[PDB]
Amino acid sequence: AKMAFTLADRVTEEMLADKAALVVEVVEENYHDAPIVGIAVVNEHGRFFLRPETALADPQFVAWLGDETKKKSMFDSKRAAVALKWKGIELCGVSFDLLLAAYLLDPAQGVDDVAAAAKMKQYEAVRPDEAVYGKGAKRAVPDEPVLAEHLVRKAAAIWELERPFLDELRRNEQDRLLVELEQPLSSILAEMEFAGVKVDTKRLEQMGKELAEQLGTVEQRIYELAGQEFNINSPKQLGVILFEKLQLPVLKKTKTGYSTSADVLEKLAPYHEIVENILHYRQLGKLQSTYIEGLLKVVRPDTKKVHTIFNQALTQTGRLSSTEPNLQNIPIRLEEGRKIRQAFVPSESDWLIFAADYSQIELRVLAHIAEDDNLMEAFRRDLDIHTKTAMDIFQVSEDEVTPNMRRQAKAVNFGIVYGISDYGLAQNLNISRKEAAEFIERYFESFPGVKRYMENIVQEAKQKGYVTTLLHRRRYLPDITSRNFNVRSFAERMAMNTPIQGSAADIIKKAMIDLNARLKEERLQAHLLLQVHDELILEAPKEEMERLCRLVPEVMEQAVTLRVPLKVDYHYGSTWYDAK
DNA sequence: GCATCATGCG
DNA sequence: GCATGATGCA
Numbered sequence A: 001a002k003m004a005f006t007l008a009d010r011v012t013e014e015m016l017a018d019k020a021a022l023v024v025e026v027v028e029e030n031y032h033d034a035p036i037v038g039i040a041v042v043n044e045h046g047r048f049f050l051r052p053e054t055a056l057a058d059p060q061f062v063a064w065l066g067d068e069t070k071k072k073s074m075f076d077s078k079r080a081a082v083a084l085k086w087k088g089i090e091l092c093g094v095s096f097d098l099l100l101a102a103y104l105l106d107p108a109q110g111v112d113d114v115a116a117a118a119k120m121k122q123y124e125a126v127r128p129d130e131a132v133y134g135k136g137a138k139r140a141v142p143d144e145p146v147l148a149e150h151l152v153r154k155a156a157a158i159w160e161l162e163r164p165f166l167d168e169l170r171r172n173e174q175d176r177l178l179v180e181l182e183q184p185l186s187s188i189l190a191e192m193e194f195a196g197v198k199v200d201t202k203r204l205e206q207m208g209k210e211l212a213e214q215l216g217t218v219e220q221r222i223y224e225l226a227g228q229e230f231n232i233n234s235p236k237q238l239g240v241i242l243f244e245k246l247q248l249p250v251l252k253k254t255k256t257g258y259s260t261s262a263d264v265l266e267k268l269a270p271y272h273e274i275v276e277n278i279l280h281y282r283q284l285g286k287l288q289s290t291y292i293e294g295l296l297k298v299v300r301p302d303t304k305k306v307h308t309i310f311n312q313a314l315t316q317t318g319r320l321s322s323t324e325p326n327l328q329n330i331p332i333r334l335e336e337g338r339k340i341r342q343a344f345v346p347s348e349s350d351w352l353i354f355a356a357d358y359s360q361i362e363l364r365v366l367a368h369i370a371e372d373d374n375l376m377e378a379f380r381r382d383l384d385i386h387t388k389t390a391m392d393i394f395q396v397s398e399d400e401v402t403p404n405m406r407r408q409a410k411a412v413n414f415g416i417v418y419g420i421s422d423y424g425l426a427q428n429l430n431i432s433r434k435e436a437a438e439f440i441e442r443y444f445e446s447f448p449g450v451k452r453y454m455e456n457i458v459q460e461a462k463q464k465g466y467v468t469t470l471l472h473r474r475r476y477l478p479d480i481t482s483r484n485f486n487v488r489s490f491a492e493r494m495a496m497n498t499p500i501q502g503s504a505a506d507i508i509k510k511a512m513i514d515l516n517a518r519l520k521e522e523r524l525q526a527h528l529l530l531q532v533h534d535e536l537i538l539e540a541p542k543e544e545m546e547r548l549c550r551l552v553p554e555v556m557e558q559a560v561t562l563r564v565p566l567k568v569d570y571h572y573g574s575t576w577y578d579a580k
Numbered sequence B: 001g002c003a004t005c006a007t008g009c010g
Numbered sequence C: 001g002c003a004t005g006a007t008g009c010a
């Protein structure tokens, strides 16, 4: 049962073949400046295990790692690449990443280790990482004999599985998606994460002080209005104060009691002065806990930078996700929270932050896919799409569109991209199911192509078992055939939404690749820092702004060619906040 | 660890 | 529609 391999004490030529499955193991979940615990190499000559302090000090091995002509097959190459970057070592030649391959074949599998990807092809001669390392804090690196065999078995699985995975990707028409989009993007994300974003800690601390002061005042006021103290952060204790001691009406409940969601308190506001204070308390509380205290906990004490990790193989639609910290959900809606962005500054003196965002990319993608004449014309005229929708569904001229009409039309546009149900829209606009249904019907009468698309995509999902995006990303929807209305409807909404949200993801990902190629050709110092679904944030010398003002929008606008143009807005400033 | 709440794009 | 993080409670 045991797998044979050479536990080498030194690097040999045999280990430097031009094709190999490579494992550069980083156990710590956050791989930034993290230890490399072992290395495994499997190639035509055999299976090998190398101690990191040995291999990484070896000139020949380091050169092999950085030789683009020496191809390597790996699992989560970004993790290895970044861990190596922190050690001043360059990893090149990665031609196949099993994590990304598994992710494209089926995002729903949740593949997060070699064992999980291998099980997809009935290969089980490798143990799950959790089984070897354990979970929680009790997660430690085992003794060399156990560690070495595990790394070798993972390398062996990768070595064996590359062909079958590539073959299936090819069958799915996803070969270029892996090789020309996701794998090249992985390297770009690695550079972004490694570069990090500089944070003005002093600014954050000051804000923390001011918030703590405002919180104390709002908190005290709340007890003053309740006639007693209690844990406002406790939905249980709060519910007792609102619906029992204060007798506020119950407009909706929760599984474990009464509902105190923002959707509820907003309606209870007129009944008691305490509600507005609770909502405000929650706003400030979120800024203090997650964006002030939380951000400060992950800022590197020396460089004062934060190094997020973009999970490239998690979302069911093809989007990236961000953690430790999540730099894709920094406040911007409310001024008080938007101020947080003043804390994100350029990493060098005399540099500025440049941000470019796609304008209505999802609705433009919908116009393209549905080939709706009315919607395509609206974007060809670059009209305010919400005002346009209002004009159509409410049957009025532009001058007759009131602010309330535009607000409701905007809610309709948000919901249409995922076939929002009448109940879903009714809740968002706080109206009846019938009224919401009338809005939707009015929308379909004005945009018949979109109605046709929603009908056709659901049927396609049922016929094929999955839906696809512009660049051939796919998502299986087995629930589309369920006899349970709720479960089936949810699958139907996913069928309508995935091609839209997914294609928008495809487009910005390609723009990122195209952009880096352009920056390199022009030898600009500018570089990417973050991506937030519809936007790209970079930093660069103040002397490069004029060139970026022309280059970035163009690359993003020309990433793909649709039936409607793509529009990109951009801003730059001394801080992320100022890049508006 | 599940539930509820907040934040982002839409 | 798609995400992450902090909190309370058990």
Ligand SMILES: OC[C@H]1O[C@@](CO)(O[C@H]2O[C@H](CO)[C@@H](O)[C@H](O)[C@H]2O)[C@@H](O)[C@@H]1O
Residues within 6 Å of the ligand: A029, A030, A031, A076, A079, A099, A111, A112, A113, A309, A311, A312, A313, A314, A323
């Ligand atoms: O390295 C990122 C890559 O690893 C996975 C597991 O294979 O996620 C791990 O690392 C993330 C970043 O620290 C953690 O959020 C996650 O909990 C941990 O398992 C993949 O999901 C990801 O693509």
Ligand SMILES: OC[C@H]1O[C@@](CO)(O[C@H]2O[C@H](CO)[C@@H](O)[C@H](O)[C@H]2O)[C@@H](O)[C@@H]1O
Residues within 6 Å of the ligand: A454, A455, A458, A459, A462, A480, A488, A492
């Ligand atoms: O009236 C048909 C209409 O209903 C939807 C759901 O909104 O689909 C239902 O009917 C289809 C048969 O035409 C089934 O395939 C599907 O499973 C069922 O939910 C729309 O897609 C369709 O336009």
Ligand SMILES: [Mg+2]
Residues within 6 Å of the ligand: A357, A358, A359, A360, A534
């Ligand atoms: Mg935008």
